[PDB]
Design a protein around this ligand. Sequence first.
Ligand SMILES: NCCCCCC(=O)O
Length: 79
Amino acid sequence: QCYHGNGQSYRGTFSTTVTGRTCQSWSSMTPHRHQRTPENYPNDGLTMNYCRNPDADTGPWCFTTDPSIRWEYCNLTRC
Ligand SMILES: NCCCCCC(=O)O
């Protein structure tokens, strides 16, 4: 349930936002269109809709399935 450092190395199966939203899959362009695809970042573990941090943010995050909300941090603690 926890990520180390900045979450850059996190490769867990959590997929829920802090708000309790569900993560959009990185390969998906819906509802939010973006460029952080497993296609463009083949080495950042952009697998299914798992919380990740391909941009060196401060914790694992994801795009959200809430059309209203583009992205949020995931509901995780820092180890
Ligand atoms: N760390 C969250 C980033 C928000 C924008 C991501 C993107 O639009 O590629």
